[PDB]
Amino acid sequence: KIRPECFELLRVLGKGGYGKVFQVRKVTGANTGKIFAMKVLKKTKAERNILEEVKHPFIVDLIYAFQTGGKLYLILEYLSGGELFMQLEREGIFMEDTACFYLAEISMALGHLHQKGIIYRDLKPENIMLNHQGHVKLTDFGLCKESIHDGTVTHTFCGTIEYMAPEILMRSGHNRAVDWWSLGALMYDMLTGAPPFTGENRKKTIDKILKCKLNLPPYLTQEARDLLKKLLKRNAASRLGAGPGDAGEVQAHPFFRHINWEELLARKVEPPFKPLLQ
Ligand SMILES: C1=C(c2c[nH]c3ccccc23)CCN(c2ncnc3[nH]ncc23)C1
Ligand SMILES: [Zn+2]
């Protein structure tokens, strides 16, 4: 039987309005000494449900889950590699091979989610973690990681909306196509140093995202520009990935022509950055 006393708290990894995350050490049972991430939620139901259903090398693992008092406890694999964001922040702009690597792993995680009817919605780089090897882990399935909350009910607009598809901002209904939009916004951020549609304030950013007039920098390879054009489109249904092939359609793009998907998935491809060496 698992309970909070089975874990000593080592440090605060993050704290939001609705939850808090610790690095923890288990001190009982056969995983004695094992390090985990512990997320504590003040009761969140769809989050646990998703993690119990998903199982993929590029999606974070859920080890234990329990509730005691008013709190829900998720015990996740500890990811020492930090946020994808941190790497983008240090590098300024990714080389295309670099960007390619991460987008390729991500696209596989998204394939898995969609096959199970799950939508990630928001690929802002602080929502993508790296494991100790430097491989991608999607981690963000909870309510909202923010301190101050937009509106007073729903949590779409709370953090940056710079990677969110037009139809999400409009609340006009949406599907998995939004995730391929967000992949394009992430890809654009990686390659250019900023997301595709930014304003001076909130209102303007939304307006630029809705107008969706893409500026493709001339510096990028032909294959990169063509993929970005195919991802960042207002018409959700016409996005690469929006069709029957889902991730398949995206993975077959020339931009990924050097990817052995078998090797990538087995994590036998060397990540461009190794957190243990940094
Ligand atoms: C950052 C997180 C976070 C930051 N601010 C928050 C506010 C509310 C809820 C969560 C957060 C969450 C995930 N995270 C992780 N770090 C390391 N191993 C991890 N395994 N699984 C997740 C995880 C670090
Ligand atoms: Zn919020």
Six token digits for residue 277: 């060496």
What resolution in Å is listed for this PDB structure?
Answer: 2.0
If asked whether residues 59 and 87 sit together in one domain, one would say no
User: Best substitution site from 139, 143, 149 to test ligand 1's pocket, by max atoms within 8 Å of Cβ?
Assistant: 139
Long-range CB contacts (within 8 A, 24+) of 140-143: 141/46, 141/47, 141/50, 141/51, 142/18, 142/19, 142/39, 142/41, 142/44, 142/47, 143/18, 143/19, 143/44, 143/47
Longest Cα–Cα distance of the chain, Å, equals 59
Is the torsion defined by CA of 165, 80, 278, 134 positive or negative? negative
How far apart (Å, rounded) are the C-alpha atoms in residues 13 and 24?
A: 10
Six token digits for residue 178: 């939004």
Q: Indicate which residues carry an active-site annotation.
A: 122
CA-wise closest residue to 112 among 162, 50, 165 = 50
Domain that holds residue 19: 1-82
What residues are neighbours of ligand 2 (ion), with CB under 5 Å?
A: 144, 146, 149, 155, 158
How far apart (Å, rounded) are the C-alpha atoms in residues 245 and 230?
A: 14
If asked whether residues 110 and 207 sit together in one domain, one would say yes
Q: Which residues line ligand 1 (CB under 6 A)?
A: 13-16, 19, 21, 37, 60, 76-79, 129, 139, 142, 145
How was it solved?
Answer: X-ray
If asked whether residues 2 and 109 sit together in one domain, one would say no
Report the CATH number at residue 37. 3.30.200.20
Q: Whose CA is nearest to atom 4 of ligand 1?
A: 14
Backbone angles phi, psi at 11, to 5 degrees: -170, 160
Question: 64 near 75, Cβ under 8 Å?
Answer: yes
If asked whether residues 45 and 95 sit together in one domain, one would say no
Q: Which of 54, 82, 110 is the last residue of a domain?
A: 82
How far apart (Å, rounded) are the C-alpha atoms in residues 90 and 101?
A: 17
How far apart (Å, rounded) are the C-alpha atoms in residues 264 and 122?
A: 23
DSSP per residue, the chain: ---GGGEEEEEEEEE-SSEEEEEEEE-SSTTTT-EEEEEEEE--HHHHHHHHH---TTBPPEEEEEEETTEEEEEEE--TT-BHHHHHHHHSS--HHHHHHHHHHHHHHHHHHHHTT-------GGGEEE-TTS-EEE---SS---SS-SSSS--SSSS--TTS-HHHHHTS---THHHHHHHHHHHHHHHHSS-S---SSHHHHHHHHHHT-----TTS-HHHHHHHHHHS-SSGGGSTTSSTTTHHHHHTSGGGTT--HHHHHTT-SPPS--GGG-
Question: What is the count of structural domains for the chain?
Answer: 2
CA-wise closest residue to 236 among 182, 161, 159, 162 = 182
